[PDB]
Ligand binder design. Structure first.
Ligand SMILES: [Fe+2]
Length: 186
């Protein structure tokens, strides 16, 4: 039974219920994430920005079933084109706007990667990606407003690939956290 999460903590409780089994109902997870209304006071603890690039801040480990994290994007900060290591990946905007660009998986031949499409994700909107859909890049193109997003990955993964837009070549990347449970990482 899906009910509206009244707070971030309630959202987390609901997600634990949704991921108690060995499969995932993607539509239900997306619906509950969209239903949570961002309340900056509830996630201020996690919203730790860096001057130079976006930060990943771990919020919950899902009893091993998922990682829930908050990403903080300075003005002009963006990501690489990346995959999601055969996991489900949900993204919900908590503050500001992000541009999401979708790319096709590259062919064996070296070539410019062309965009399938792009969209602007606005506050409280929740998107979903997985490797079968394609690759994406996420960017805060704003010059005046930092952005903050909530990401859920299941199963958890700590490695993925980044793709060079000019060739499609991929490189393995290990993700890092800037903080965990509100505590900065050494
Ligand atoms: Fe992503």
């Amino acid at each position: 039974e899906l009910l509206k999460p009244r707070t971030l903590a309630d959202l987390i409780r609901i997600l634990h219920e949704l991921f108690a089994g060995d499969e995932v109902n993607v539509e239900e997870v997306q619906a509950v994430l969209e239903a949570y209304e961002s309340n900056p006071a509830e996630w201020a603890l996690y919203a730790k920005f860096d001057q130079y690039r976006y930060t990943r801040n771990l919020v919950d480990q899902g009893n091993g079933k998922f990682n829930l994290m908050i990403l903080c994007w300075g003005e002009g900060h963006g990501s690489s084109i990346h995959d999601h290591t055969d996991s489900h990946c949900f993204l919900k905007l908590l503050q500001g706007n992000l541009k999401e660009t979708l790319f096709d998986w590259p062919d064996k031949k070296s070539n410019e990667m062309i965009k399938k499409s792009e969209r602007t994700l606005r506050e409280n909107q929740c998107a979903y990606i997985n490797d079968s859909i394609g690759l994406h890049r996420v960017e805060n193109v704003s010059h005046t407003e930092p952005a903050v997003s909530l990401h859920l990955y299941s199963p958890p993964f700590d490695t993925c690939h980044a793709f060079d837009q000019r060739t499609g070549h991929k490189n393995k990347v290990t993700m890092t956290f800037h903080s965990k449970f509100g505590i900065r990482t050494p």
